[PDB]
Amino acid sequence: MSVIRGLAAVLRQSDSDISAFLVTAPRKYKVYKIPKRTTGFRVIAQPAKGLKDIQRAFVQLYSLPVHDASMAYMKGKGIRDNAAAHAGNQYLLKADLEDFFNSITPAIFWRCIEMSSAQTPQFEPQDKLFIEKILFWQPIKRRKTKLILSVGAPSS
DNA sequence: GGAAGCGAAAGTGTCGCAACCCGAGAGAGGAACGATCTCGGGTTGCGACACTTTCGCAACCCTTAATACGTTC
């Protein structure tokens, strides 16, 4: 059963319960606005508690490769290390990506899985739909194809 | 992604003005018939402008969030 079997073994729940939960999982999100520091608002989609636990279990079960140049969302590394990497230099080229989190789609995720140069955990073709439902958020109720990563989630 | 309003941008029709044409008419001259200038419609071309269509800004935040204190995405 692969992914669902491991999720059941971690959450101490039946396969049927998790499978029934992972039907509208891309839709079980609570969206809200936080105030910007100067003016305006920022919209965040946060999943429900059960989906949050499912995402945490999925993240801890499968270890995707990460690079040493990345400094966000890893243990023992953070703002201080990122700043100290360029501390001794003379010139910098800070640059940003346009709408980073909402531009990531399941197509991108599956393209990156297959061609990754490092070790990648093996996902059976039967559970790819469950992977997409677990990891990705679905804005717009009518559109079931639009699946994007949500900035702010245990798995994003 | 995109309510509801609204306005930008671009394309298309329209409608009034000018410019000209053409027939009617009173009657200059000088001895009659009708030159010549004007009146009244009528047609066409043209360009400014009104009207028409499409696009795009960005409400809300969906059932579904957490709430020691601070930076960062």
Side-chain angles (χ1 to χ4, degrees):
Chain A
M1 187 66 204
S2 177
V3 165
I4 301 306
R5 181 74 266 174
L7 261 62
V10 174
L11 272 78
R12 285 92 62 194
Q13 293 179 356
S14 77
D15 284 330
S16 160
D17 174 13
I18 290 177
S19 182
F21 188 101
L22 301 173
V23 175
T24 63
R27 178 70 275 172
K28 297 167 174 298
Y29 278 67
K30 177 58 169 286
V31 299
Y32 47 89
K33 307 198 272 146
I34 71 165
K36 273 177 173 242
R37 265 164 187 169
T38 50
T39 191
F41 289 105
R42 210 176 274 261
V43 178
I44 295 89
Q46 181 171 175
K49 294 178 286 294
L51 184 54
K52 265 193 277 206
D53 289 281
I54 282 183
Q55 291 179 325
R56 299 214 186 77
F58 176 78
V59 165
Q60 293 179 356
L61 274 166
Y62 305 98
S63 65
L64 303 172
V66 296
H67 199 246
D68 290 330
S70 296
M71 302 288 189
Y73 317 123
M74 294 182 286
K75 324 270 189 52
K77 300 166 74 172
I79 299 301
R80 205 199 51 205
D81 289 330
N82 188 22
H86 321 267
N89 282 164
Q90 192 174 6
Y91 310 124
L92 59 80
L93 185 48
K94 176 62 72 74
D96 291 331
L97 289 162
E98 200 148 38
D99 199 344
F100 173 70
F101 275 98
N102 281 14
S103 283
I104 297 171
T105 47
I108 293 175
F109 183 50
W110 293 128
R111 184 176 176 87
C112 283
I113 283 284
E114 63 190 1
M115 61 79 71
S116 79
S117 66
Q119 188 176 2
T120 297
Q122 191 75 15
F123 296 121
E124 292 180 351
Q126 188 258 327
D127 53 59
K128 309 206 149 204
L129 187 153
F130 293 99
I131 304 293
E132 300 180 351
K133 284 184 175 291
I134 287 163
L135 294 175
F136 293 87
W137 169 47
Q138 176 199 139
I140 297 89
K141 186 180 289 293
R142 65 179 177 88
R143 203 178 301 177
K144 300 262 180 263
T145 300
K146 176 146 167 59
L147 289 168
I148 57 171
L149 276 190
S150 159
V151 61
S155 73
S156 280

Short mmCIF file of all heavy atoms in Angstrom, two decimals, chain A residues 27-31 37 46 49 52 73 79 140 142-143, chain B residues 1-2 59-66 70-73:
data_model
loop_
_atom_site.label_atom_id
_atom_site.label_comp_id
_atom_site.label_asym_id
_atom_site.label_seq_id
_atom_site.Cartn_x
_atom_site.Cartn_y
_atom_site.Cartn_z
N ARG A 27 -8.41 20.53 -0.67
CA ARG A 27 -9.41 21.56 -0.45
C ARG A 27 -9.57 21.91 1.03
O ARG A 27 -10.08 22.99 1.33
CB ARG A 27 -10.75 21.10 -1.03
CG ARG A 27 -11.90 22.06 -0.83
CD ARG A 27 -11.69 23.28 -1.70
NE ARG A 27 -10.86 24.27 -1.04
CZ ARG A 27 -10.38 25.36 -1.63
NH1 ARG A 27 -10.63 25.62 -2.90
NH2 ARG A 27 -9.69 26.22 -0.91
N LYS A 28 -9.13 21.04 1.94
CA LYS A 28 -9.28 21.26 3.38
C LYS A 28 -8.25 22.28 3.89
O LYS A 28 -7.36 21.97 4.68
CB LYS A 28 -9.12 19.95 4.14
CG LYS A 28 -10.16 18.89 3.85
CD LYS A 28 -9.73 17.54 4.41
CE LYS A 28 -10.83 16.50 4.25
NZ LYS A 28 -12.07 16.88 4.98
N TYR A 29 -8.40 23.52 3.44
CA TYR A 29 -7.50 24.60 3.83
C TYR A 29 -8.28 25.79 4.36
O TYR A 29 -9.33 26.15 3.81
CB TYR A 29 -6.62 25.05 2.65
CG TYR A 29 -5.40 24.19 2.42
CD1 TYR A 29 -5.52 22.88 1.99
CD2 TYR A 29 -4.12 24.69 2.62
CE1 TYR A 29 -4.41 22.09 1.77
CE2 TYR A 29 -3.00 23.92 2.41
CZ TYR A 29 -3.15 22.61 1.98
OH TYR A 29 -2.04 21.84 1.77
N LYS A 30 -7.77 26.39 5.42
CA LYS A 30 -8.31 27.63 5.98
C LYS A 30 -7.41 28.78 5.57
O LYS A 30 -6.23 28.80 5.92
CB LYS A 30 -8.42 27.54 7.50
CG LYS A 30 -8.91 28.79 8.18
CD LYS A 30 -10.28 29.19 7.66
CE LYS A 30 -10.90 30.28 8.52
NZ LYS A 30 -11.37 29.74 9.82
N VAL A 31 -7.97 29.74 4.83
CA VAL A 31 -7.20 30.86 4.30
C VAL A 31 -7.55 32.11 5.08
O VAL A 31 -8.72 32.33 5.44
CB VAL A 31 -7.43 31.05 2.79
CG1 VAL A 31 -7.01 29.81 2.03
CG2 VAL A 31 -8.81 31.29 2.48
N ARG A 37 3.83 44.70 7.17
CA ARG A 37 4.50 45.57 8.13
C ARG A 37 4.35 47.04 7.78
O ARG A 37 4.31 47.89 8.68
CB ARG A 37 5.97 45.18 8.24
CG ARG A 37 6.24 44.23 9.38
CD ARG A 37 7.59 43.55 9.26
NE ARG A 37 7.74 42.52 10.27
CZ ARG A 37 8.72 41.63 10.26
NH1 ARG A 37 9.60 41.63 9.29
NH2 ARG A 37 8.78 40.71 11.22
N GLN A 46 -3.71 27.73 5.31
CA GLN A 46 -3.23 26.77 6.29
C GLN A 46 -4.17 25.58 6.34
O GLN A 46 -5.38 25.75 6.51
CB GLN A 46 -3.13 27.41 7.68
CG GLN A 46 -2.63 26.46 8.76
CD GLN A 46 -2.33 27.16 10.07
OE1 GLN A 46 -2.00 26.53 11.06
NE2 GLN A 46 -2.46 28.45 10.08
N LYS A 49 -6.15 20.50 10.95
CA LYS A 49 -5.27 19.79 11.88
C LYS A 49 -4.94 18.39 11.39
O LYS A 49 -3.78 17.96 11.42
CB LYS A 49 -5.90 19.74 13.27
CG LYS A 49 -6.04 21.10 13.93
CD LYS A 49 -6.71 20.99 15.29
CE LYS A 49 -8.20 20.74 15.15
NZ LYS A 49 -8.90 21.89 14.52
N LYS A 52 -2.68 18.59 8.53
CA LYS A 52 -1.37 19.01 9.02
C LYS A 52 -0.59 17.83 9.58
O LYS A 52 0.60 17.66 9.28
CB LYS A 52 -1.53 20.10 10.08
CG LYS A 52 -1.42 21.51 9.54
CD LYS A 52 -1.26 22.52 10.66
CE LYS A 52 -2.61 22.88 11.25
NZ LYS A 52 -2.59 24.22 11.85
N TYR A 73 14.57 26.46 6.46
CA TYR A 73 13.78 25.28 6.81
C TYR A 73 14.63 24.03 7.04
O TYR A 73 14.18 22.92 6.75
CB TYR A 73 12.70 25.00 5.76
CG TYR A 73 11.98 26.23 5.26
CD1 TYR A 73 11.96 26.55 3.91
CD2 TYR A 73 11.31 27.07 6.14
CE1 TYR A 73 11.30 27.67 3.45
CE2 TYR A 73 10.64 28.19 5.69
CZ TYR A 73 10.64 28.48 4.34
OH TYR A 73 9.98 29.60 3.88
N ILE A 79 18.96 32.28 9.76
CA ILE A 79 19.30 33.61 9.27
C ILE A 79 20.77 33.92 9.52
O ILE A 79 21.45 34.51 8.67
CB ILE A 79 18.38 34.66 9.93
CG1 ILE A 79 16.93 34.37 9.57
CG2 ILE A 79 18.74 36.05 9.48
CD1 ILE A 79 16.69 34.38 8.09
N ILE A 140 -9.76 27.77 -5.62
CA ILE A 140 -10.87 27.76 -6.56
C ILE A 140 -11.54 26.39 -6.55
O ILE A 140 -10.98 25.40 -7.03
CB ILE A 140 -10.43 28.15 -7.99
CG1 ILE A 140 -9.88 29.58 -8.04
CG2 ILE A 140 -11.58 28.00 -8.96
CD1 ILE A 140 -8.40 29.70 -7.77
N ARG A 142 -14.19 25.19 -8.17
CA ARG A 142 -14.62 24.62 -9.44
C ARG A 142 -13.45 24.00 -10.20
O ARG A 142 -13.62 22.97 -10.87
CB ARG A 142 -15.32 25.69 -10.28
CG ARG A 142 -14.42 26.83 -10.72
CD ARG A 142 -15.17 27.84 -11.57
NE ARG A 142 -14.31 28.97 -11.91
CZ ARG A 142 -13.50 29.00 -12.96
NH1 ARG A 142 -13.42 27.99 -13.80
NH2 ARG A 142 -12.75 30.08 -13.17
N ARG A 143 -12.27 24.60 -10.11
CA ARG A 143 -11.11 24.13 -10.86
C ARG A 143 -10.38 23.07 -10.03
O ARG A 143 -9.71 23.39 -9.04
CB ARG A 143 -10.18 25.29 -11.20
CG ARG A 143 -9.29 25.01 -12.40
CD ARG A 143 -8.41 26.20 -12.72
NE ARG A 143 -9.20 27.39 -13.03
CZ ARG A 143 -8.68 28.58 -13.29
NH1 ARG A 143 -7.37 28.77 -13.31
NH2 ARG A 143 -9.49 29.60 -13.55
P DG B 1 -4.93 31.81 -13.33
OP1 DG B 1 -4.99 32.62 -14.56
OP2 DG B 1 -4.02 32.19 -12.23
"O5'" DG B 1 -6.41 31.68 -12.72
"C5'" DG B 1 -6.67 32.10 -11.39
"C4'" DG B 1 -8.16 32.17 -11.13
"O4'" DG B 1 -8.40 32.49 -9.74
"C3'" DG B 1 -8.89 33.25 -11.90
"O3'" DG B 1 -10.27 32.92 -11.99
"C2'" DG B 1 -8.67 34.46 -11.00
"C1'" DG B 1 -8.84 33.83 -9.62
N9 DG B 1 -8.07 34.47 -8.57
C8 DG B 1 -6.72 34.69 -8.55
N7 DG B 1 -6.30 35.27 -7.46
C5 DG B 1 -7.45 35.44 -6.70
C6 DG B 1 -7.62 36.00 -5.42
O6 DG B 1 -6.76 36.49 -4.67
N1 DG B 1 -8.95 35.97 -5.02
C2 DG B 1 -9.99 35.46 -5.76
N2 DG B 1 -11.21 35.51 -5.20
N3 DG B 1 -9.84 34.92 -6.96
C4 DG B 1 -8.55 34.94 -7.37
P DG B 2 -11.23 33.70 -13.01
OP1 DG B 2 -12.37 32.82 -13.33
OP2 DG B 2 -10.39 34.25 -14.10
"O5'" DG B 2 -11.77 34.94 -12.15
"C5'" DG B 2 -12.47 34.72 -10.94
"C4'" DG B 2 -12.92 36.03 -10.33
"O4'" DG B 2 -11.79 36.67 -9.68
"C3'" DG B 2 -13.47 37.04 -11.32
"O3'" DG B 2 -14.58 37.73 -10.76
"C2'" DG B 2 -12.29 37.97 -11.59
"C1'" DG B 2 -11.51 37.92 -10.29
N9 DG B 2 -10.06 38.00 -10.49
C8 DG B 2 -9.37 37.66 -11.62
N7 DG B 2 -8.09 37.83 -11.52
C5 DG B 2 -7.91 38.32 -10.24
C6 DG B 2 -6.73 38.69 -9.56
O6 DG B 2 -5.56 38.66 -9.98
N1 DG B 2 -6.99 39.13 -8.27
C2 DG B 2 -8.24 39.21 -7.70
N2 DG B 2 -8.29 39.66 -6.44
N3 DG B 2 -9.36 38.86 -8.32
C4 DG B 2 -9.12 38.43 -9.58
P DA B 59 -8.56 43.55 -3.21
OP1 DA B 59 -7.82 44.62 -2.52
OP2 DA B 59 -7.97 42.20 -3.32
"O5'" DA B 59 -10.01 43.40 -2.54
"C5'" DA B 59 -10.85 44.54 -2.44
"C4'" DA B 59 -12.31 44.14 -2.26
"O4'" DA B 59 -12.81 43.52 -3.45
"C3'" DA B 59 -12.59 43.11 -1.19
"O3'" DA B 59 -12.57 43.70 0.10
"C2'" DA B 59 -13.99 42.66 -1.58
"C1'" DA B 59 -13.97 42.77 -3.11
N9 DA B 59 -13.94 41.46 -3.78
C8 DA B 59 -14.88 40.47 -3.66
N7 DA B 59 -14.62 39.40 -4.36
C5 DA B 59 -13.42 39.70 -4.99
C6 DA B 59 -12.62 38.97 -5.88
N6 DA B 59 -12.92 37.73 -6.29
N1 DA B 59 -11.49 39.55 -6.32
C2 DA B 59 -11.19 40.78 -5.90
N3 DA B 59 -11.87 41.57 -5.07
C4 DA B 59 -12.99 40.97 -4.64
P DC B 60 -12.04 42.87 1.37
OP1 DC B 60 -12.57 43.51 2.58
OP2 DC B 60 -10.58 42.68 1.20
"O5'" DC B 60 -12.73 41.43 1.21
"C5'" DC B 60 -14.07 41.23 1.63
"C4'" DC B 60 -14.56 39.85 1.22
"O4'" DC B 60 -14.45 39.71 -0.21
"C3'" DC B 60 -13.77 38.69 1.81
"O3'" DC B 60 -14.38 38.29 3.05
"C2'" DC B 60 -13.89 37.61 0.75
"C1'" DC B 60 -14.07 38.40 -0.55
N1 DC B 60 -12.84 38.47 -1.40
C2 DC B 60 -12.44 37.36 -2.16
O2 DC B 60 -13.11 36.32 -2.10
N3 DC B 60 -11.33 37.45 -2.92
C4 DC B 60 -10.63 38.59 -2.96
N4 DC B 60 -9.54 38.63 -3.73
C5 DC B 60 -11.02 39.73 -2.20
C6 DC B 60 -12.12 39.62 -1.44
P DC B 61 -13.50 37.80 4.31
OP1 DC B 61 -14.39 37.60 5.46
OP2 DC B 61 -12.32 38.68 4.44
"O5'" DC B 61 -12.96 36.38 3.86
"C5'" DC B 61 -13.84 35.39 3.37
"C4'" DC B 61 -13.02 34.27 2.82
"O4'" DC B 61 -12.53 34.66 1.51
"C3'" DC B 61 -11.77 34.03 3.65
"O3'" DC B 61 -12.01 33.09 4.76
"C2'" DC B 61 -10.79 33.54 2.63
"C1'" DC B 61 -11.20 34.23 1.35
N1 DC B 61 -10.32 35.40 0.98
C2 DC B 61 -9.31 35.23 0.03
O2 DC B 61 -9.16 34.13 -0.51
N3 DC B 61 -8.53 36.29 -0.29
C4 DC B 61 -8.72 37.47 0.31
N4 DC B 61 -7.92 38.48 -0.04
C5 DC B 61 -9.74 37.65 1.29
C6 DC B 61 -10.51 36.60 1.59
P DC B 62 -12.12 31.49 4.58
OP1 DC B 62 -12.68 31.01 5.85
OP2 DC B 62 -10.89 30.83 4.14
"O5'" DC B 62 -13.23 31.27 3.48
"C5'" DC B 62 -14.60 31.23 3.87
"C4'" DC B 62 -15.44 30.62 2.77
"O4'" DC B 62 -14.81 30.87 1.49
"C3'" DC B 62 -15.62 29.11 2.86
"O3'" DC B 62 -16.90 28.73 2.36
"C2'" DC B 62 -14.49 28.60 1.99
"C1'" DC B 62 -14.46 29.65 0.89
N1 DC B 62 -13.12 29.80 0.24
C2 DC B 62 -12.61 28.75 -0.49
O2 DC B 62 -13.26 27.74 -0.57
N3 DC B 62 -11.39 28.88 -1.08
C4 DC B 62 -10.71 30.02 -0.94
N4 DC B 62 -9.52 30.11 -1.54
C5 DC B 62 -11.23 31.11 -0.19
C6 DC B 62 -12.43 30.96 0.38
P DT B 63 -17.53 27.30 2.76
OP1 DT B 63 -17.03 26.29 1.80
OP2 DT B 63 -18.99 27.47 2.95
"O5'" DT B 63 -16.90 27.00 4.19
"C5'" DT B 63 -17.42 27.64 5.34
"C4'" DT B 63 -17.00 26.88 6.58
"O4'" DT B 63 -17.29 25.47 6.37
"C3'" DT B 63 -15.51 26.95 6.91
"O3'" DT B 63 -15.34 26.99 8.33
"C2'" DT B 63 -14.97 25.66 6.32
"C1'" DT B 63 -16.12 24.72 6.62
N1 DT B 63 -16.16 23.48 5.81
C2 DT B 63 -15.93 22.29 6.44
O2 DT B 63 -15.67 22.20 7.63
N3 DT B 63 -16.00 21.19 5.63
C4 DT B 63 -16.28 21.16 4.28
O4 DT B 63 -16.32 20.12 3.64
C5 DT B 63 -16.52 22.45 3.67
C7 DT B 63 -16.83 22.54 2.21
C6 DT B 63 -16.45 23.54 4.46
P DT B 64 -13.97 27.53 8.99
OP1 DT B 64 -14.16 27.56 10.45
OP2 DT B 64 -13.58 28.77 8.29
"O5'" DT B 64 -12.90 26.38 8.67
"C5'" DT B 64 -12.89 25.19 9.45
"C4'" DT B 64 -11.67 24.34 9.17
"O4'" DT B 64 -11.96 23.42 8.09
"C3'" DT B 64 -10.43 25.11 8.72
"O3'" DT B 64 -9.24 24.49 9.23
"C2'" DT B 64 -10.50 24.99 7.20
"C1'" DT B 64 -11.01 23.57 7.07
N1 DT B 64 -11.66 23.27 5.77
C2 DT B 64 -11.92 21.96 5.46
O2 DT B 64 -11.64 21.04 6.19
N3 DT B 64 -12.52 21.77 4.25
C4 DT B 64 -12.88 22.74 3.33
O4 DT B 64 -13.42 22.46 2.26
C5 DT B 64 -12.58 24.10 3.72
C7 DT B 64 -12.93 25.24 2.80
C6 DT B 64 -11.99 24.30 4.91
P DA B 65 -8.87 24.52 10.79
OP1 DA B 65 -8.97 23.13 11.29
OP2 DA B 65 -9.64 25.58 11.48
"O5'" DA B 65 -7.32 24.88 10.81
"C5'" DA B 65 -6.81 25.92 10.00
"C4'" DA B 65 -5.70 26.66 10.72
"O4'" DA B 65 -5.79 28.08 10.41
"C3'" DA B 65 -5.76 26.55 12.24
"O3'" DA B 65 -4.87 25.52 12.68
"C2'" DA B 65 -5.30 27.93 12.71
"C1'" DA B 65 -5.77 28.85 11.60
N9 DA B 65 -7.10 29.41 11.79
C8 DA B 65 -8.26 28.75 12.09
N7 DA B 65 -9.31 29.53 12.17
C5 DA B 65 -8.81 30.79 11.91
C6 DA B 65 -9.42 32.06 11.85
N6 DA B 65 -10.72 32.26 12.06
N1 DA B 65 -8.63 33.11 11.56
C2 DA B 65 -7.32 32.91 11.35
N3 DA B 65 -6.64 31.77 11.38
C4 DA B 65 -7.45 30.74 11.67
P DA B 66 -4.84 25.05 14.22
OP1 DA B 66 -4.09 23.79 14.29
OP2 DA B 66 -6.21 25.12 14.78
"O5'" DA B 66 -3.99 26.19 14.96
"C5'" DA B 66 -2.61 26.37 14.67
"C4'" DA B 66 -2.08 27.52 15.50
"O4'" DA B 66 -2.77 28.73 15.10
"C3'" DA B 66 -2.30 27.36 17.00
"O3'" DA B 66 -1.06 27.47 17.73
"C2'" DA B 66 -3.30 28.46 17.38
"C1'" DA B 66 -3.20 29.45 16.23
N9 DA B 66 -4.48 30.08 15.91
C8 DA B 66 -5.70 29.46 15.83
N7 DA B 66 -6.69 30.26 15.52
C5 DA B 66 -6.08 31.49 15.39
C6 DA B 66 -6.59 32.77 15.07
N6 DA B 66 -7.89 33.00 14.82
N1 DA B 66 -5.72 33.79 15.02
C2 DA B 66 -4.43 33.56 15.27
N3 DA B 66 -3.83 32.41 15.58
C4 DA B 66 -4.72 31.40 15.62
P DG B 70 6.77 40.04 20.10
OP1 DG B 70 6.11 41.35 19.92
OP2 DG B 70 6.34 38.90 19.27
"O5'" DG B 70 8.33 40.23 19.87
"C5'" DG B 70 8.82 40.38 18.56
"C4'" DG B 70 10.31 40.16 18.53
"O4'" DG B 70 10.64 39.03 19.38
"C3'" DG B 70 10.86 39.79 17.17
"O3'" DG B 70 11.17 40.97 16.42
"C2'" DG B 70 12.12 39.02 17.55
"C1'" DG B 70 11.61 38.23 18.75
N9 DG B 70 11.00 36.94 18.42
C8 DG B 70 9.70 36.56 18.65
N7 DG B 70 9.43 35.34 18.27
C5 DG B 70 10.64 34.88 17.75
C6 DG B 70 10.97 33.62 17.19
O6 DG B 70 10.24 32.64 17.02
N1 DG B 70 12.30 33.57 16.79
C2 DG B 70 13.20 34.60 16.92
N2 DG B 70 14.45 34.38 16.49
N3 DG B 70 12.90 35.78 17.45
C4 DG B 70 11.61 35.85 17.84
P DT B 71 10.21 41.46 15.23
OP1 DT B 71 10.69 42.79 14.79
OP2 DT B 71 8.79 41.31 15.63
"O5'" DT B 71 10.48 40.40 14.07
"C5'" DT B 71 11.24 40.79 12.93
"C4'" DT B 71 12.68 40.38 13.06
"O4'" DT B 71 12.82 39.43 14.14
"C3'" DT B 71 13.25 39.65 11.85
"O3'" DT B 71 13.73 40.58 10.91
"C2'" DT B 71 14.38 38.86 12.47
"C1'" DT B 71 13.74 38.42 13.78
N1 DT B 71 13.05 37.10 13.68
C2 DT B 71 11.86 36.85 14.35
O2 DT B 71 11.30 37.66 15.05
N3 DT B 71 11.35 35.61 14.17
C4 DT B 71 11.87 34.59 13.41
O4 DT B 71 11.33 33.51 13.32
C5 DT B 71 13.11 34.91 12.73
C7 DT B 71 13.78 33.89 11.87
C6 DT B 71 13.63 36.12 12.90
P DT B 72 13.06 40.67 9.45
OP1 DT B 72 13.81 41.65 8.65
OP2 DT B 72 11.65 40.83 9.68
"O5'" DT B 72 13.26 39.21 8.84
"C5'" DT B 72 14.51 38.83 8.32
"C4'" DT B 72 14.46 37.44 7.71
"O4'" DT B 72 14.16 36.48 8.74
"C3'" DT B 72 13.38 37.23 6.67
"O3'" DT B 72 13.83 37.68 5.40
"C2'" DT B 72 13.22 35.72 6.69
"C1'" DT B 72 13.50 35.37 8.15
N1 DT B 72 12.30 35.04 8.94
C2 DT B 72 11.78 33.77 8.88
O2 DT B 72 12.26 32.89 8.18
N3 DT B 72 10.67 33.57 9.65
C4 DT B 72 10.04 34.48 10.47
O4 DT B 72 9.05 34.20 11.13
C5 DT B 72 10.64 35.79 10.49
C7 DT B 72 10.05 36.88 11.34
C6 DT B 72 11.73 36.01 9.74
P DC B 73 12.77 38.02 4.25
OP1 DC B 73 13.51 38.64 3.13
OP2 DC B 73 11.65 38.75 4.89
"O5'" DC B 73 12.22 36.59 3.79
"C5'" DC B 73 13.02 35.77 2.97
"C4'" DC B 73 12.56 34.32 3.02
"O4'" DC B 73 11.96 34.04 4.30
"C3'" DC B 73 11.52 33.92 1.97
"O3'" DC B 73 11.84 32.64 1.44
"C2'" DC B 73 10.23 33.87 2.76
"C1'" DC B 73 10.73 33.39 4.11
N1 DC B 73 9.83 33.76 5.21
C2 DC B 73 8.89 32.84 5.67
O2 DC B 73 8.84 31.72 5.14
N3 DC B 73 8.06 33.21 6.67
C4 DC B 73 8.16 34.43 7.20
N4 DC B 73 7.32 34.75 8.19
C5 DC B 73 9.10 35.38 6.74
C6 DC B 73 9.91 35.01 5.75
#
